[model samples]
Target: GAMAPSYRVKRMDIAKNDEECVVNAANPRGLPGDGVCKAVYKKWPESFKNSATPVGTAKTVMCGTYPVIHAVGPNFSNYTESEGDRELAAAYREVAKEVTRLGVNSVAIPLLSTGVYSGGKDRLTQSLNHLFTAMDSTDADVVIYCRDKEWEKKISEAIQMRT
Candidate 1:
């Protein structure tokens, strides 16, 4: 039999997932509106809304088998500042910690700042690099979900470059 590899990084449309925890790049106010957040909000509005927390924090909300991992990230107003990188790393680190605390085996995360924040490609790559590095020591299997096939390919290549 083929042996399964551990510590794998995969990509998918987050809206189609049923992982134990699905990480979202939320506004500092912890609201869900654009991208995957919007889809999640539509499917699990109450649970998602109730998981809201202050900026630069992480929160979990249960929706049956799916638990939303909300990580407050930079919005359009502040994505350009250097602080956005710090915040992004912090959010990812927090998610890693929460994954251990919650005893979840897998989590889905998006490329923060690529959506409504409209960050540049360089910024997106940097953010992804930061996330993978921060999560390298976490106990959970982290999946980087993308919006489309092109993005999936690009991000997957970036992940390879890091490893």
Candidate 2:
């Protein structure tokens, strides 16, 4: 039997949360941008002192001083919607699996590919759909943090459409 996890869509700063671990959306090259990774690095630079080689897409890295998951996602800046969406699905799936494996009770993840990746609203909705669907099967308390109310509402709508 599958039990849906306790989850919520919130408009807040993931970096401000005290979850056991938070997810960082990065490119296959493991490069950080001004979005999710920026906030994370600002809070825990020492954790990422030694940059590793490109870990490929959808790979998860245990970095950051406070137990973080550096999920290597797609570079929407140079990819199509179908390609990016598939990468998002894989990334979210890996995150859920890692969370469960680590026995982490709580996690906060951003809507990957929608920020500086220039993925736009459709990507936002698709990303949320993939992430929410993946986490719905896990026991971790997952929080998909959006930057504002509109994004939250859009995510809510997307979830509804899926259900």
Candidate 3:
């Protein structure tokens, strides 16, 4: 029987997750905001300017209680199909590799590009797949946090469709 998968998806705030590391799909500032980043800011005990990384690259900040991996995803609305796809894949791969490179025990990640980046349901579906595929290199405890029960249900279906 399957005891447990390498990861799980649920409705929760990534910032509230107690993982040793967390991934934030963020802009250059990575500061306080009305979006999920706001929660991250609130939980963070320090103030620092989150530097910008290219769409395919990633940045890491491990100064505080937990390390934060900032992934810059592409805005599909602007790029061509192939360019968009490649950048998204690169972003996901970079984030997952960082977890392995840092030897983090556990990490929480959100569905990058699925919000203000103009990624729709199909993008969310593909995002999960890209993330897990890259994450296969690591044994870190993984949690894919969703913002709502609706998203949780959709992500559950996406996970099922993957297998």
- Cα displacement (angstroms), candidate 3, residue 152, comes to 0.7
Against the correct fold, how does model 1 do in TM-score?
A: 0.81
- Flag clash pairs in model 3: none
Tens-digit lDDT string for candidate 3 (80-138): 77887788889988987788788777888888778877544357667787887788667
On lDDT, the candidate that comes out on top is: 3
Candidate closer to the true structure by lDDT (higher is better), 1 or 3: 3
Q: What is the TM-score of each candidate against the true structure?
A: 0.81, 0.80, 0.84
Mark the regions of model 1 whose C-alpha exceeds 4 Å error after superposition.
Answer: 1-12, 119-122
Give the C-alpha lDDT of model 3. Answer: 0.74
10 residues in a row with least lDDT, candidate 2: 51-60
Name the weakest run of 10 consecutive residues (lDDT summed) in model 1.
1-10
Candidate 1 residue-wise lDDT, 59-143, digit = tens: 8877786677788766535555677767777777787777777877777787776676755444567667767776777666677
Please give the clash total of every predicted structure, in order.
0, 0, 0
Question: Which numbered prediction scores highest in TM-score against the true structure?
Answer: 3
